[PDB]
Every structure is written in structure tokens, then in C-alpha cells.
PDB file of C-alpha atoms and ligand atoms in Angstrom:
ATOM      1  CA  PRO A   1      -0.047  -0.002   0.003  1.00  0.00           C
ATOM      2  CA  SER A   2       1.034   3.600  -0.648  1.00  0.00           C
ATOM      3  CA  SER A   3       2.229   5.970   2.052  1.00  0.00           C
ATOM      4  CA  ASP A   4       1.757   8.985  -0.314  1.00  0.00           C
ATOM      5  CA  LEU A   5       0.070  11.460   1.885  1.00  0.00           C
ATOM      6  CA  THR A   6      -0.312  13.961  -0.998  1.00  0.00           C
ATOM      7  CA  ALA A   7      -2.114  11.291  -3.093  1.00  0.00           C
ATOM      8  CA  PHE A   8      -4.318  10.458  -0.090  1.00  0.00           C
ATOM      9  CA  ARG A   9      -5.134  14.183   0.581  1.00  0.00           C
ATOM     10  CA  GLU A  10      -6.276  14.451  -3.141  1.00  0.00           C
ATOM     11  CA  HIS A  11      -8.860  11.747  -2.438  1.00  0.00           C
ATOM     12  CA  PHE A  12      -9.747  13.603   0.750  1.00  0.00           C
ATOM     13  CA  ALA A  13     -10.363  16.909  -1.206  1.00  0.00           C
ATOM     14  CA  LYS A  14     -12.873  15.112  -3.379  1.00  0.00           C
ATOM     15  CA  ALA A  15     -14.808  12.964  -0.761  1.00  0.00           C
ATOM     16  CA  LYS A  16     -18.394  13.758   0.272  1.00  0.00           C
ATOM     17  CA  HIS A  17     -18.942  10.786   2.532  1.00  0.00           C
ATOM     18  CA  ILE A  18     -16.113   9.844   4.744  1.00  0.00           C
ATOM     19  CA  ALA A  19     -16.244   6.755   7.093  1.00  0.00           C
ATOM     20  CA  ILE A  20     -13.751   6.729   9.951  1.00  0.00           C
ATOM     21  CA  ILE A  21     -13.402   3.402  11.714  1.00  0.00           C
ATOM     22  CA  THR A  22     -11.598   3.411  15.084  1.00  0.00           C
ATOM     23  CA  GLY A  23     -10.219   1.044  17.651  1.00  0.00           C
ATOM     24  CA  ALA A  24      -8.305   1.162  20.927  1.00  0.00           C
ATOM     25  CA  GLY A  25      -5.079   2.531  19.227  1.00  0.00           C
ATOM     26  CA  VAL A  26      -6.859   5.896  18.680  1.00  0.00           C
ATOM     27  CA  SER A  27      -7.397   6.148  22.496  1.00  0.00           C
ATOM     28  CA  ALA A  28      -4.023   4.731  23.668  1.00  0.00           C
ATOM     29  CA  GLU A  29      -2.309   8.168  23.699  1.00  0.00           C
ATOM     30  CA  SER A  30      -5.009   9.391  26.079  1.00  0.00           C
ATOM     31  CA  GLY A  31      -3.175   7.117  28.598  1.00  0.00           C
ATOM     32  CA  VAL A  32      -5.383   3.976  28.612  1.00  0.00           C
ATOM     33  CA  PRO A  33      -4.600   0.354  27.673  1.00  0.00           C
ATOM     34  CA  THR A  34      -5.376  -1.250  24.318  1.00  0.00           C
ATOM     35  CA  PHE A  35      -6.625  -4.788  24.312  1.00  0.00           C
ATOM     36  CA  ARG A  36      -3.801  -6.644  22.648  1.00  0.00           C
ATOM     37  CA  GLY A  37      -0.943  -4.237  22.706  1.00  0.00           C
ATOM     38  CA  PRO A  38       1.765  -4.421  25.440  1.00  0.00           C
ATOM     39  CA  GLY A  39       0.131  -4.016  28.783  1.00  0.00           C
ATOM     40  CA  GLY A  40      -3.266  -4.506  27.062  1.00  0.00           C
ATOM     41  CA  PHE A  41      -6.354  -5.793  28.866  1.00  0.00           C
ATOM     42  CA  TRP A  42      -6.291  -9.176  27.075  1.00  0.00           C
ATOM     43  CA  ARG A  43      -2.604  -9.515  27.873  1.00  0.00           C
ATOM     44  CA  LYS A  44      -3.049  -8.874  31.630  1.00  0.00           C
ATOM     45  CA  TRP A  45      -6.274 -10.933  31.907  1.00  0.00           C
ATOM     46  CA  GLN A  46      -7.788 -13.728  29.910  1.00  0.00           C
ATOM     47  CA  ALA A  47     -10.585 -12.427  27.808  1.00  0.00           C
ATOM     48  CA  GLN A  48     -12.757 -15.605  28.445  1.00  0.00           C
ATOM     49  CA  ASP A  49     -12.875 -14.611  32.185  1.00  0.00           C
ATOM     50  CA  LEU A  50     -14.065 -11.022  31.576  1.00  0.00           C
ATOM     51  CA  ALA A  51     -15.714 -10.633  28.158  1.00  0.00           C
ATOM     52  CA  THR A  52     -18.061 -13.493  27.293  1.00  0.00           C
ATOM     53  CA  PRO A  53     -21.590 -14.235  28.349  1.00  0.00           C
ATOM     54  CA  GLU A  54     -20.347 -17.363  30.216  1.00  0.00           C
ATOM     55  CA  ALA A  55     -17.732 -15.274  32.059  1.00  0.00           C
ATOM     56  CA  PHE A  56     -20.603 -13.093  33.353  1.00  0.00           C
ATOM     57  CA  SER A  57     -22.870 -16.003  34.296  1.00  0.00           C
ATOM     58  CA  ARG A  58     -20.112 -17.737  36.141  1.00  0.00           C
ATOM     59  CA  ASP A  59     -18.534 -14.747  37.923  1.00  0.00           C
ATOM     60  CA  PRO A  60     -20.516 -11.513  37.546  1.00  0.00           C
ATOM     61  CA  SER A  61     -18.434  -9.727  40.361  1.00  0.00           C
ATOM     62  CA  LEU A  62     -15.077 -10.376  38.808  1.00  0.00           C
ATOM     63  CA  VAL A  63     -16.473  -9.032  35.477  1.00  0.00           C
ATOM     64  CA  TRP A  64     -18.067  -5.990  37.210  1.00  0.00           C
ATOM     65  CA  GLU A  65     -14.887  -5.307  39.154  1.00  0.00           C
ATOM     66  CA  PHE A  66     -13.025  -5.056  35.780  1.00  0.00           C
ATOM     67  CA  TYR A  67     -15.687  -2.729  34.223  1.00  0.00           C
ATOM     68  CA  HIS A  68     -15.871  -0.700  37.498  1.00  0.00           C
ATOM     69  CA  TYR A  69     -11.990  -0.223  37.432  1.00  0.00           C
ATOM     70  CA  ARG A  70     -12.146   0.873  33.809  1.00  0.00           C
ATOM     71  CA  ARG A  71     -15.010   3.287  34.425  1.00  0.00           C
ATOM     72  CA  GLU A  72     -13.173   4.902  37.320  1.00  0.00           C
ATOM     73  CA  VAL A  73      -9.913   5.285  35.354  1.00  0.00           C
ATOM     74  CA  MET A  74     -11.737   6.688  32.247  1.00  0.00           C
ATOM     75  CA  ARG A  75     -13.694   9.518  34.028  1.00  0.00           C
ATOM     76  CA  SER A  76     -10.695  11.804  34.035  1.00  0.00           C
ATOM     77  CA  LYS A  77      -9.225  10.824  30.708  1.00  0.00           C
ATOM     78  CA  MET A  78      -9.181  13.347  27.822  1.00  0.00           C
ATOM     79  CA  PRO A  79      -9.395  13.219  24.071  1.00  0.00           C
ATOM     80  CA  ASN A  80      -5.971  13.203  22.374  1.00  0.00           C
ATOM     81  CA  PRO A  81      -4.942  14.955  19.142  1.00  0.00           C
ATOM     82  CA  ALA A  82      -6.399  12.095  17.097  1.00  0.00           C
ATOM     83  CA  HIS A  83      -9.914  12.290  18.629  1.00  0.00           C
ATOM     84  CA  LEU A  84      -9.749  16.034  18.327  1.00  0.00           C
ATOM     85  CA  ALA A  85      -8.601  16.039  14.611  1.00  0.00           C
ATOM     86  CA  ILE A  86     -11.536  13.705  13.915  1.00  0.00           C
ATOM     87  CA  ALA A  87     -14.124  16.015  15.659  1.00  0.00           C
ATOM     88  CA  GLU A  88     -12.847  19.200  13.979  1.00  0.00           C
ATOM     89  CA  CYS A  89     -12.918  17.421  10.628  1.00  0.00           C
ATOM     90  CA  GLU A  90     -16.540  16.419  11.085  1.00  0.00           C
ATOM     91  CA  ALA A  91     -17.544  19.948  12.115  1.00  0.00           C
ATOM     92  CA  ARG A  92     -15.594  21.516   9.232  1.00  0.00           C
ATOM     93  CA  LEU A  93     -16.853  19.163   6.517  1.00  0.00           C
ATOM     94  CA  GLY A  94     -20.418  19.172   7.981  1.00  0.00           C
ATOM     95  CA  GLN A  95     -20.424  22.926   7.562  1.00  0.00           C
ATOM     96  CA  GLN A  96     -19.742  22.445   3.843  1.00  0.00           C
ATOM     97  CA  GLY A  97     -22.411  19.746   3.183  1.00  0.00           C
ATOM     98  CA  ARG A  98     -19.938  16.751   3.352  1.00  0.00           C
ATOM     99  CA  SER A  99     -20.456  13.784   5.719  1.00  0.00           C
ATOM    100  CA  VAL A 100     -18.025  12.314   8.210  1.00  0.00           C
ATOM    101  CA  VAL A 101     -19.174   9.408  10.254  1.00  0.00           C
ATOM    102  CA  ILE A 102     -17.245   7.665  13.038  1.00  0.00           C
ATOM    103  CA  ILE A 103     -17.672   3.927  13.463  1.00  0.00           C
ATOM    104  CA  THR A 104     -16.030   2.990  16.701  1.00  0.00           C
ATOM    105  CA  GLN A 105     -15.108  -0.240  18.426  1.00  0.00           C
ATOM    106  CA  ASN A 106     -14.181   1.680  21.607  1.00  0.00           C
ATOM    107  CA  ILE A 107     -16.616   1.920  24.445  1.00  0.00           C
ATOM    108  CA  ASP A 108     -14.663   4.659  26.209  1.00  0.00           C
ATOM    109  CA  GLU A 109     -16.798   7.566  24.912  1.00  0.00           C
ATOM    110  CA  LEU A 110     -13.775   9.694  24.196  1.00  0.00           C
ATOM    111  CA  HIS A 111     -15.018  10.535  20.647  1.00  0.00           C
ATOM    112  CA  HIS A 112     -18.108  12.089  22.429  1.00  0.00           C
ATOM    113  CA  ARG A 113     -15.828  13.917  24.861  1.00  0.00           C
ATOM    114  CA  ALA A 114     -14.090  15.453  21.800  1.00  0.00           C
ATOM    115  CA  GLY A 115     -17.308  16.795  20.309  1.00  0.00           C
ATOM    116  CA  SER A 116     -17.934  14.147  17.618  1.00  0.00           C
ATOM    117  CA  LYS A 117     -21.639  13.794  16.856  1.00  0.00           C
ATOM    118  CA  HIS A 118     -22.059  11.239  14.090  1.00  0.00           C
ATOM    119  CA  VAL A 119     -20.693   8.308  16.159  1.00  0.00           C
ATOM    120  CA  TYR A 120     -21.785   4.685  15.955  1.00  0.00           C
ATOM    121  CA  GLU A 121     -20.605   2.772  19.109  1.00  0.00           C
ATOM    122  CA  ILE A 122     -20.738  -0.726  17.688  1.00  0.00           C
ATOM    123  CA  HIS A 123     -19.405  -2.463  20.898  1.00  0.00           C
ATOM    124  CA  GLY A 124     -21.553  -0.406  23.389  1.00  0.00           C
ATOM    125  CA  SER A 125     -20.453   1.967  26.108  1.00  0.00           C
ATOM    126  CA  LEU A 126     -18.298   1.823  29.208  1.00  0.00           C
ATOM    127  CA  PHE A 127     -20.809   4.100  30.920  1.00  0.00           C
ATOM    128  CA  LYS A 128     -24.136   2.319  30.003  1.00  0.00           C
ATOM    129  CA  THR A 129     -25.937  -0.403  31.848  1.00  0.00           C
ATOM    130  CA  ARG A 130     -28.307  -3.104  30.628  1.00  0.00           C
ATOM    131  CA  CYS A 131     -30.801  -4.838  33.017  1.00  0.00           C
ATOM    132  CA  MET A 132     -30.703  -8.635  32.943  1.00  0.00           C
ATOM    133  CA  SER A 133     -34.447  -8.865  33.810  1.00  0.00           C
ATOM    134  CA  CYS A 134     -36.245  -6.006  32.174  1.00  0.00           C
ATOM    135  CA  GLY A 135     -33.725  -5.089  29.420  1.00  0.00           C
ATOM    136  CA  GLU A 136     -33.643  -1.347  30.221  1.00  0.00           C
ATOM    137  CA  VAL A 137     -30.519   0.431  28.780  1.00  0.00           C
ATOM    138  CA  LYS A 138     -29.351   3.562  30.731  1.00  0.00           C
ATOM    139  CA  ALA A 139     -26.387   5.914  30.881  1.00  0.00           C
ATOM    140  CA  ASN A 140     -24.904   5.356  34.376  1.00  0.00           C
ATOM    141  CA  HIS A 141     -22.107   7.676  35.493  1.00  0.00           C
ATOM    142  CA  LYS A 142     -22.364   6.978  39.294  1.00  0.00           C
ATOM    143  CA  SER A 143     -18.949   6.820  40.941  1.00  0.00           C
ATOM    144  CA  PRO A 144     -18.749   4.190  42.290  1.00  0.00           C
ATOM    145  CA  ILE A 145     -21.524   2.472  40.300  1.00  0.00           C
ATOM    146  CA  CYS A 146     -22.599   0.707  43.485  1.00  0.00           C
ATOM    147  CA  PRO A 147     -21.528   1.088  47.158  1.00  0.00           C
ATOM    148  CA  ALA A 148     -19.919  -2.435  47.384  1.00  0.00           C
ATOM    149  CA  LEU A 149     -17.504  -1.443  44.586  1.00  0.00           C
ATOM    150  CA  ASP A 150     -16.301   1.694  46.346  1.00  0.00           C
ATOM    151  CA  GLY A 151     -12.489   1.738  46.365  1.00  0.00           C
ATOM    152  CA  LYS A 152     -12.104  -1.520  44.389  1.00  0.00           C
ATOM    153  CA  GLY A 153      -9.204  -1.660  42.019  1.00  0.00           C
ATOM    154  CA  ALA A 154      -8.303  -3.936  39.159  1.00  0.00           C
ATOM    155  CA  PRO A 155      -9.474  -7.475  40.000  1.00  0.00           C
ATOM    156  CA  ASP A 156      -7.408 -10.633  40.512  1.00  0.00           C
ATOM    157  CA  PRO A 157      -9.460 -13.735  39.812  1.00  0.00           C
ATOM    158  CA  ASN A 158      -7.378 -15.622  42.355  1.00  0.00           C
ATOM    159  CA  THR A 159      -8.467 -13.290  45.229  1.00  0.00           C
ATOM    160  CA  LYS A 160     -11.749 -15.041  45.925  1.00  0.00           C
ATOM    161  CA  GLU A 161     -12.110 -12.843  49.069  1.00  0.00           C
ATOM    162  CA  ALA A 162     -12.399  -9.677  46.934  1.00  0.00           C
ATOM    163  CA  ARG A 163     -15.520 -10.917  45.197  1.00  0.00           C
ATOM    164  CA  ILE A 164     -18.821  -9.220  45.996  1.00  0.00           C
ATOM    165  CA  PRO A 165     -22.153 -11.114  46.451  1.00  0.00           C
ATOM    166  CA  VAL A 166     -24.354 -10.788  43.428  1.00  0.00           C
ATOM    167  CA  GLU A 167     -27.137  -9.072  45.331  1.00  0.00           C
ATOM    168  CA  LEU A 168     -24.733  -6.136  46.115  1.00  0.00           C
ATOM    169  CA  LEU A 169     -23.684  -5.718  42.486  1.00  0.00           C
ATOM    170  CA  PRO A 170     -25.339  -2.936  40.338  1.00  0.00           C
ATOM    171  CA  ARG A 171     -29.072  -3.475  40.333  1.00  0.00           C
ATOM    172  CA  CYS A 172     -31.805  -1.943  38.203  1.00  0.00           C
ATOM    173  CA  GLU A 173     -33.208   1.181  39.947  1.00  0.00           C
ATOM    174  CA  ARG A 174     -36.410   1.047  37.879  1.00  0.00           C
ATOM    175  CA  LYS A 175     -39.302   0.958  40.294  1.00  0.00           C
ATOM    176  CA  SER A 176     -40.378  -2.767  40.768  1.00  0.00           C
ATOM    177  CA  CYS A 177     -37.458  -4.510  39.001  1.00  0.00           C
ATOM    178  CA  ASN A 178     -34.163  -4.889  40.991  1.00  0.00           C
ATOM    179  CA  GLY A 179     -32.746  -7.123  38.176  1.00  0.00           C
ATOM    180  CA  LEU A 180     -28.906  -7.572  37.930  1.00  0.00           C
ATOM    181  CA  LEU A 181     -27.295  -5.073  35.600  1.00  0.00           C
ATOM    182  CA  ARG A 182     -24.519  -5.862  33.262  1.00  0.00           C
ATOM    183  CA  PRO A 183     -22.325  -3.512  31.293  1.00  0.00           C
ATOM    184  CA  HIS A 184     -24.026  -2.525  28.035  1.00  0.00           C
ATOM    185  CA  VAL A 185     -21.212  -3.763  25.838  1.00  0.00           C
ATOM    186  CA  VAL A 186     -20.772  -6.406  23.169  1.00  0.00           C
ATOM    187  CA  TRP A 187     -18.944  -9.488  24.348  1.00  0.00           C
ATOM    188  CA  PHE A 188     -17.400 -12.297  22.294  1.00  0.00           C
ATOM    189  CA  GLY A 189     -20.175 -14.524  20.986  1.00  0.00           C
ATOM    190  CA  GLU A 190     -22.882 -11.880  21.179  1.00  0.00           C
ATOM    191  CA  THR A 191     -24.538 -10.216  18.218  1.00  0.00           C
ATOM    192  CA  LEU A 192     -24.061  -6.487  17.636  1.00  0.00           C
ATOM    193  CA  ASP A 193     -27.200  -4.397  17.859  1.00  0.00           C
ATOM    194  CA  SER A 194     -28.996  -4.952  14.550  1.00  0.00           C
ATOM    195  CA  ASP A 195     -30.178  -1.327  14.269  1.00  0.00           C
ATOM    196  CA  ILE A 196     -26.617  -0.155  14.610  1.00  0.00           C
ATOM    197  CA  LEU A 197     -25.226  -2.760  12.337  1.00  0.00           C
ATOM    198  CA  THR A 198     -27.740  -2.008   9.630  1.00  0.00           C
ATOM    199  CA  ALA A 199     -26.997   1.757   9.737  1.00  0.00           C
ATOM    200  CA  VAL A 200     -23.299   1.134   9.666  1.00  0.00           C
ATOM    201  CA  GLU A 201     -23.803  -1.079   6.658  1.00  0.00           C
ATOM    202  CA  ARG A 202     -25.569   1.680   4.711  1.00  0.00           C
ATOM    203  CA  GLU A 203     -22.823   4.208   5.784  1.00  0.00           C
ATOM    204  CA  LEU A 204     -20.188   1.881   4.306  1.00  0.00           C
ATOM    205  CA  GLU A 205     -22.198   1.546   1.046  1.00  0.00           C
ATOM    206  CA  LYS A 206     -22.410   5.336   0.741  1.00  0.00           C
ATOM    207  CA  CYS A 207     -18.842   6.203   1.765  1.00  0.00           C
ATOM    208  CA  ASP A 208     -16.385   7.395  -0.968  1.00  0.00           C
ATOM    209  CA  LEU A 209     -13.396   7.405   1.405  1.00  0.00           C
ATOM    210  CA  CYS A 210     -12.652   5.193   4.367  1.00  0.00           C
ATOM    211  CA  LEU A 211      -9.999   5.505   7.197  1.00  0.00           C
ATOM    212  CA  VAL A 212      -9.059   2.653   9.555  1.00  0.00           C
ATOM    213  CA  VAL A 213      -7.389   3.949  12.691  1.00  0.00           C
ATOM    214  CA  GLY A 214      -5.833   2.108  15.645  1.00  0.00           C
ATOM    215  CA  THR A 215      -7.461  -1.295  15.235  1.00  0.00           C
ATOM    216  CA  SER A 216      -5.801  -4.710  14.995  1.00  0.00           C
ATOM    217  CA  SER A 217      -8.412  -5.781  12.319  1.00  0.00           C
ATOM    218  CA  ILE A 218      -8.582  -9.151  14.179  1.00  0.00           C
ATOM    219  CA  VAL A 219     -12.171  -8.880  15.642  1.00  0.00           C
ATOM    220  CA  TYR A 220     -15.206  -9.483  13.568  1.00  0.00           C
ATOM    221  CA  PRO A 221     -17.352  -8.052  12.059  1.00  0.00           C
ATOM    222  CA  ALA A 222     -15.490  -4.766  12.383  1.00  0.00           C
ATOM    223  CA  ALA A 223     -12.269  -6.148  10.762  1.00  0.00           C
ATOM    224  CA  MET A 224     -14.076  -6.637   7.478  1.00  0.00           C
ATOM    225  CA  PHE A 225     -15.791  -3.254   7.314  1.00  0.00           C
ATOM    226  CA  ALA A 226     -12.857  -1.537   5.545  1.00  0.00           C
ATOM    227  CA  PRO A 227     -12.097  -4.577   3.477  1.00  0.00           C
ATOM    228  CA  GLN A 228     -15.680  -4.560   2.302  1.00  0.00           C
ATOM    229  CA  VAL A 229     -15.518  -0.959   1.242  1.00  0.00           C
ATOM    230  CA  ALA A 230     -12.161  -1.512  -0.516  1.00  0.00           C
ATOM    231  CA  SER A 231     -13.717  -4.344  -2.596  1.00  0.00           C
ATOM    232  CA  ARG A 232     -16.046  -1.710  -4.032  1.00  0.00           C
ATOM    233  CA  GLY A 233     -13.006   0.293  -5.330  1.00  0.00           C
ATOM    234  CA  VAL A 234     -13.233   2.934  -2.606  1.00  0.00           C
ATOM    235  CA  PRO A 235      -9.870   4.184  -1.247  1.00  0.00           C
ATOM    236  CA  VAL A 236      -9.090   2.997   2.260  1.00  0.00           C
ATOM    237  CA  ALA A 237      -6.274   4.478   4.320  1.00  0.00           C
ATOM    238  CA  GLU A 238      -4.948   2.547   7.304  1.00  0.00           C
ATOM    239  CA  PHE A 239      -3.391   4.468  10.263  1.00  0.00           C
ATOM    240  CA  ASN A 240      -1.595   2.122  12.577  1.00  0.00           C
ATOM    241  CA  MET A 241       1.627   1.509  14.380  1.00  0.00           C
ATOM    242  CA  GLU A 242       2.027  -1.792  12.480  1.00  0.00           C
ATOM    243  CA  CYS A 243       0.647  -3.884   9.657  1.00  0.00           C
ATOM    244  CA  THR A 244      -2.451  -5.895  10.313  1.00  0.00           C
ATOM    245  CA  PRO A 245      -4.283  -8.842   8.647  1.00  0.00           C
ATOM    246  CA  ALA A 246      -6.029  -6.299   6.509  1.00  0.00           C
ATOM    247  CA  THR A 247      -3.245  -3.894   5.384  1.00  0.00           C
ATOM    248  CA  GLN A 248      -2.719  -5.540   1.960  1.00  0.00           C
ATOM    249  CA  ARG A 249      -6.423  -4.852   1.029  1.00  0.00           C
ATOM    250  CA  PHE A 250      -6.072  -1.040   1.364  1.00  0.00           C
ATOM    251  CA  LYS A 251      -4.790   1.668  -0.995  1.00  0.00           C
ATOM    252  CA  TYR A 252      -2.828   3.505   1.812  1.00  0.00           C
ATOM    253  CA  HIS A 253      -1.036   2.635   4.987  1.00  0.00           C
ATOM    254  CA  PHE A 254       0.315   5.410   7.211  1.00  0.00           C
ATOM    255  CA  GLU A 255       2.665   3.966   9.842  1.00  0.00           C
ATOM    256  CA  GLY A 256       3.026   5.625  13.159  1.00  0.00           C
ATOM    257  CA  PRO A 257       1.197   6.901  16.236  1.00  0.00           C
ATOM    258  CA  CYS A 258      -2.163   8.336  15.065  1.00  0.00           C
ATOM    259  CA  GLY A 259      -1.707  11.339  17.383  1.00  0.00           C
ATOM    260  CA  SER A 260       0.870  12.568  14.706  1.00  0.00           C
ATOM    261  CA  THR A 261      -0.083  10.695  11.566  1.00  0.00           C
ATOM    262  CA  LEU A 262      -3.838  11.450  11.587  1.00  0.00           C
ATOM    263  CA  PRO A 263      -4.102  15.263  12.034  1.00  0.00           C
ATOM    264  CA  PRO A 264      -2.190  16.207   8.785  1.00  0.00           C
ATOM    265  CA  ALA A 265      -4.316  13.659   6.933  1.00  0.00           C
ATOM    266  CA  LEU A 266      -7.510  15.347   8.058  1.00  0.00           C
ATOM    267  CA  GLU A 267      -6.229  18.912   7.726  1.00  0.00           C
TER     268      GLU A 267
HETATM  269 ZN1   ZN B   1     -34.692  -3.763  35.263  1.00  0.00          ZN
END
């Protein structure tokens, strides 16, 4: 793939419908882990203990402890130059009748903190709950999310004594429910929201330029979004610190930290 930023910016000058796909690499520089990078969440912990439906049925406290920890860390984190370049791009293009849409894998909400509006959160949100009984979805920004989690840090599955009884974990505050809440996120083996997925699909059919920023292009279906668009002849530009399973499908690859590689692309 080309690293000709001039040639890419020519495609950028002519695009009316830009699709920007993002993963944890776009948030790294804000000072939070990725999933599979060094010090990543799935390096430190085993994903099958924390991010599957079975994980949650077998040990909802361990799982909640991990999402609680992440919520408490993320509160004070700020959008980095890559988030900010994306937001300013959307606002600038939007003012001229051109569309920029963000299709994010990240649940951290940092694209909303930056001022981005057209944001599909395809794996849910760190800050939303879903009730296991009634199905109610809610923003929840209580700190701590429940009293029993107050002052809990990152969980060790071997410290059985740190586990909280299930009745003291976050419960639905809807009058007459009290069901157990789970994070409103998409785990391995769970379908993505079909409304979201459908809308994303149409965005990808309409886009005339696609960027793929800070994702390992391992996890499906997100990993095939940009490959799909490229199979229609649309230019895709990858921004990543390394090559991925998908790089050889794309017209451009811009190597480096997105904090520095992305802002001149979007200028
Ligand atoms: Zn409920």
C-alpha cells in the first residue's frame, strides 16, 4: 500500500462521505490500555474470564470489578490529538455539506468527549448499563456504580475474598425491577445491535473514502468493514503503528502513532 500522503489528501479533497473506523489505538495516547498491545487488557487478563456471556454468568463480580475499574480510570481521561482532529474534521466538513461518520469499536466515549456527533458505538459504552431482567438500557455515571464497589481496584481472579455477592452488584433502579445489571457492551459470541449494524452497513455503502485507525483488524465483524468498502473500489487508508491482517487490502497505509499521523491527513 502507498504511504503517499499527497495522493491520499487528493482523495480527501474530493470525498463527500467519509467513514472513519476506530479502535483502541486511537485512545491509547490518552493514557489507557489497548486490548492486545503491550500491557493490554487481554494480555493482563484472559478475555474468556471477563468478556463473554459465560464469564458473566459464572462470575458477575469479577467482571463488574473489571468494568468498574475501567470506568473509574476513564472518568478523568481526555481526548488526544487524534480524537480532536476527527471531531474538528466532522464539524468543518459538515459545515460544507460533506459527511463524516465515526464507526467505533471503543466503548470509552472519548469521541463524544471530543465533540464528535455522528458516532456509531458498535461495541456499546463503558458508561451504559443493561438490566438482565427488564432489558432497560441507561447511561450510568455513578462513581462508584454501587456502594460495594467503592474503592475496588483492578481485579485478581485468584483473590476469591475480593468478590462481591451478586445481590450487592449494580441493580436496576427502575421501580419494581431490581434485576442484575451488566455493562451494556458487546462481548465475544454476542450479536451487535441490529439497528446499529444496519445503519453502519448503509454508511459503508455510501462512503467514498474510508479510514481505519488504531485497530488490530482481528475482531469481527469490524475487521471486514474496511475490506468490504475496498472491494467496491473505494480508497481505504490505514493508520496504525504496524501492519495488520487487513493492510494488503487497502490503498494507503500510514505507519506511526495516530496522534501525529492522523491530524495532517484530516487537515
Ligand atoms: Zn430492570
